[PDB]
């Protein structure tokens, strides 16, 4: 298919992606965990309880049966507000981790897609080598049947033929592996894939890296997740700062308490005090609590999270020196791959002129049919490493746009505007 | 040694294995952690307490010395029953994580074993190259001492000889590293290792991939650990479903409580109320508690673990597409590596013909002794990449069986039925 | 720059190192977290409370306003003393994890330094190839303009020229990458770097491995972190052994308690019992608690940490066989790399003689100017793989010392006493 229908099946059915989409749904749901202790805590509680004295307290035994309804509320506790702000930012992280995994799918689909078109073409290469080096064997054998070569040059040329098998079988094996790199990323065995339109394919010079990198610092996802990790661990400071701050929570505990006596001291005058006490109480109010001095535990956690922030503030700079290396890598990979194509497109023009010197040289007779088929195979060796350079250009645009972070389904379209007529993956 | 005694020392003495075997013992012991809160909580407590009033409550001060024995019990709490069921499945995971690490030890021993026999033979290769390219040098020197060559053809031939030293030293160094890859996996320096019996070695065609992969899905361990990953996080939903369900526990708190007064209000009529009260109580009964509304914390944890299950459900489909690429990789490696052998088995028959064209060509005199020894080295270049292809076939059987999960000490024996006569590992 | 000023900017500005430097400051600060529950726990609490009876308990309602100051103290709990000892040893681990990252900086500075001087010289190589293979093109063209070659022999030679573009562009791309590998580790673009002084550089024979590995076991940082990992998990046993031990903690809870009635049963005789009870209490004493039987939770955690220790004792043996492999690897890498040098230094002496056979051959006229420049590029091929062997010798000294753990700024000086005169990183 065209690469979009390869990607649009891959977008809906990537298990590497739908896992992260679930964790992006998990982290956004994890905010509702964090905002929930700010919401009330209504819980029912019931008790049966039989006290049993065995001393001076013997004879006073009671079936104190009490049921109660508790409600507590985070009136003022800035840690839960911070843990809300922690969890939003960690969800802001985990949205970016998803935003990587869109582009990671977009990249690795086209990577696995063009590795099929590589291996489709290597299959077209090596069967044109097996039409050649078997033809080399099928005449070095037919020289030995006459007497032109020694038995080495047969048993050599068979070994040069059987190496063609141990390359062409691997070509047929790297075909199915590349298909199963692609089923791994999309979901299905794909019969035909869209080959590259050489007519609508241009060697565009990319944008200058000083404009790329400042665009990368607004968008790139290793950097952006490292920004928000710094934004995460800065609030981890202020969480530990909220152990200094007091904890004011609300008390609301309502419920019955039936307290019925038993035992030997129940036998008595009972003094208008010893009756089957059937009571009920509703305690409303507030619970204030301030940690004054926890042995500097809170100050330790503040001092911990400060170095943990400096530990995280290096992970910005760890990534912020890494994006500069990564952006300049792909920009200096594509500038390689532009000159790589303008080599291997010239290397086609060699092996196209060298082939057509043979076809004219065989039509008049000076070169033989096996110097044709070797030069045919010399042509397809150009046209792999042409196409492989044509794919690694089209990959390294995506390696730019992913390292820019601007990678989407629009840069994918600029690939798929160049993929016009299909070629199959079926070993003939 | 034969591969079994290499493995049987490795099976008993692999720190990569025994750490997992300790963790397989640590995971099954962790089940007894899970079943332990279902068992009682018998704990003895004791208190000394001097109340000190300083207000209207001054004068009522007491050395309240109380010692109490406590017992509680998980009467009804489905989360602990779930945590029992989680931990059995999570140790059901970690049993499979061990079951990988048996086969990982089976494979990586055979990987490190056959990398010795490779590196032994490269050592036998490169000294048959150093017997060759030295005689290449040691005649260009004698051509220069006469005058047949320029000083370039000596200092080239010294450089082509010194490259052979820069390979035969690495062959000796990759020998000792291969021994130390083997000592890393087994435990000892091994003096002689069993070379491959070429007579009882066959190029068997493997079972078809439609039979392999359906046998893989019943057995394969990355998949099986991912199935039980799904089975673990499915119950993590039902753990979070047990925040809905109430918590019924038992109360058994029994013990003395001596209350002996002090202060100014102790001086008085005492009302037959103010004595050194020496008491003791046994509270039996049940503790019921139902979380009604925790701010949707419980529902969020359900909704967390639902999407966390989908992430685990995608990690099955991650691995269930990753088993297919892994199984077809090995099945398309071994189909290559058969043809790789029949390539380099012919490359021996080429080079053994080319060698015997020299030994007959030197015994009559047409080719010289260095054109022999170059073609001798051409023979041993075939007999690496023969034997290396003989090992990579025998490795990729284990890359099948480990990616099938059927790898055991029986597929090991099919390797070791082919390793018959020993060869040393000492550079002569 | 010389390598020290490259390192001394890298020492002060490595975002990988300063991250671990903060984590080294984190774990040492985390000790003060561990010693803090041994320190007192002073916390202020305050309550407002309105009881609301609705039964036989109706009419008794009160504004029980109580404020309380609490202080608790770890009198006797050996787990906190163990968790102090756990944290110090985990800080003993994390100090070693820093000590790796000193050397990991020292190595990867020198590695990324010597990969610039690799790529500088490949840039000096490949322009001498483009000063050669362009002259190969620029006279096959002038053979064709007269008629000595076919159009295949030009369009091949153009393709051999355009491959030299597709290397020399990558040489300039790998130049900027190596500069940005260096900016990634130090912090800046560096204009000139000190090339290797070949005169004061020697091919020293290293220390024997029987002394190295015993000096490694006293010093090496993977192994030392694994020892302290074992030293960590042994105390993890003695933590869970301190669940057996009792928990004696101090009670110091002091504070007011103002209890002012309200309701219908407040109206009454009041019995010198029902007043605005404005009270206050100070509870001093101790809290003793002994877990007798937690369902075998404590024994299981002992039995967990025992098998977890054996896993850690295998992680010693995991690393302790790994260091034996690692130390012998670098020692057998540098023994390779010395013989690599005396290969590629001889390969200079060939390609110096083969060049000087051209300069004496072109000055008299037998060989042409392109056979000069092709043999010049033959020289600069030797001078990469000499210099690369001159760099891999100097790296594999540090791969010894980092896998010894004796790597510091003194072995770095033995590098930098060989880096004398600067060469630049600017493609001319």
Author numbering:
A (entry chain C), B (entry chain F), C (entry chain I): 1 to 428
Authors' account:
Drug efflux pumps play important roles in intrinsic or acquired drug resistance to a wide variety of currently available antimicrobial agents. AcrAB-TolC is a RND-based tripartite efflux pump, comprised of the outer membrane protein TolC, the periplasmic membrane fusion protein AcrA, and the inner membrane transporter AcrB, which cycles through three different conformational states during the drug transport process: access (L), binding (T) and extrusion (O). A small peptide, AcrZ, has been identified that modifies the activity of AcrB. In this study, we report the near-atomic resolution cryoEM structures of the AcrAB-TolC pump captured in both resting and drug transport states.
The inhibitor MBX3132 likely binds AcrB tightly, since it is active in the nanomolar concentration range, and the compound was used to lock the pump in a more homogeneous conformation. The 3D map for the pump/MBX3132 complex was initially generated without any imposed symmetry and exhibited an apparent 3-fold symmetric pattern. Thus, refinements were performed with 3-fold symmetry, which produced the final 3D reconstruction at ~3.6 Å resolution. Subsets of particles show AcrB conformations in LLL (1.4%), LLT (6.2%) and LTT (18.6%) states, respectively, while none of the subunits was identified in an ‘O’ state. Therefore, this inhibitor-bound pump conformation primarily represents a T-saturated state of the AcrB. We observed clear density for the inhibitor in a 'hydrophobic trap' site adjacent to the drug binding of the AcrB trimer in both the asymmetric and symmetry imposed maps. Comparing the structure of TolC in the crystal or in the apo pump with that in the inhibitor-bound pump assembly reveals that TolC adopts a fully opened state through an iris-like dilation of the periplasmic end. In the presence of inhibitor MBX3132, the AcrB trimer is predominantly trapped in the symmetric TTT conformation, possibly because the inhibitor has high affinity to AcrB and cannot be transported. Thus, the cryoEM structure suggests that inhibitors like MBX3132 could effectively inhibit AcrAB-TolC efflux through saturated binding and blocking all sites and prevent AcrB from cycling through different states.
